[PDB]
Design a protein around this ligand. Sequence first.
Ligand SMILES: C[C@H](CCC(=O)NCC(=O)O)[C@H]1CC[C@H]2[C@@H]3[C@H](O)C[C@@H]4C[C@H](O)CC[C@]4(C)[C@H]3C[C@H](O)[C@]12C
Ligand SMILES: C[C@H](CCC(=O)NCC(=O)O)[C@H]1CC[C@H]2[C@@H]3[C@H](O)C[C@@H]4C[C@H](O)CC[C@]4(C)[C@H]3CC[C@]12C
Length: 127
Amino acid sequence: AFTGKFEMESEKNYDEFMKLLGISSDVIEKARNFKIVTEVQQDGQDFTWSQHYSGGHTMTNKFTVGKESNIQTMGGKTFKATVQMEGGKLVVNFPNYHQTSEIVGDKLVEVSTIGGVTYERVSKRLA
Ligand SMILES: C[C@H](CCC(=O)NCC(=O)O)[C@H]1CC[C@H]2[C@@H]3[C@H](O)C[C@@H]4C[C@H](O)CC[C@]4(C)[C@H]3C[C@H](O)[C@]12C
Ligand SMILES: C[C@H](CCC(=O)NCC(=O)O)[C@H]1CC[C@H]2[C@@H]3[C@H](O)C[C@@H]4C[C@H](O)CC[C@]4(C)[C@H]3CC[C@]12C
């Protein structure tokens, strides 16, 4: 149950990480300067995050954890894989991608891998 409103303030390897994944400039220009917000909603197996960035564009995804072909990017591009829970933390696995998504303490903490190279992110809640 990841639900809430969270503000980000940490980006590590950000400009290279988001390019490799397939952001041209759109989300990364907004993240480096303004640092992204979100509103999350989890209904057991069913999941939704909605994110918002500087000019007040929305990007959402809605998927069922352990189900496939409903999951989409910061840009909102759809993909097919199996999102998995392990210790209550959400992960996908790909040839080119991996990541893991969790709550530590009261703070929200994410650690990600593309092409074998690492990203990590940090956020504070105010729901
Ligand atoms: C507000 C931002 C948005 C990320 C973004 O779009 N950044 C562009 C960039 O990284 O440059 C992040 C910070 C940490 C994220 C959370 C962490 O992964 C932990 C936690 C993981 C859950 O599985 C789903 C909700 C969420 C709260 C995540 C939702 C949302 O994703 C958050 C709270
Ligand atoms: C940073 C990556 C990818 C960004 C990207 O590929 N952008 C391409 C584009 O913008 O064109 C983000 C975007 C959306 C994310 C997924 C969606 O938010 C849904 C899902 C949520 C769980 O916390 C973790 C797994 C999972 C499945 C997320 C894994 C990391 C993804 C795939």
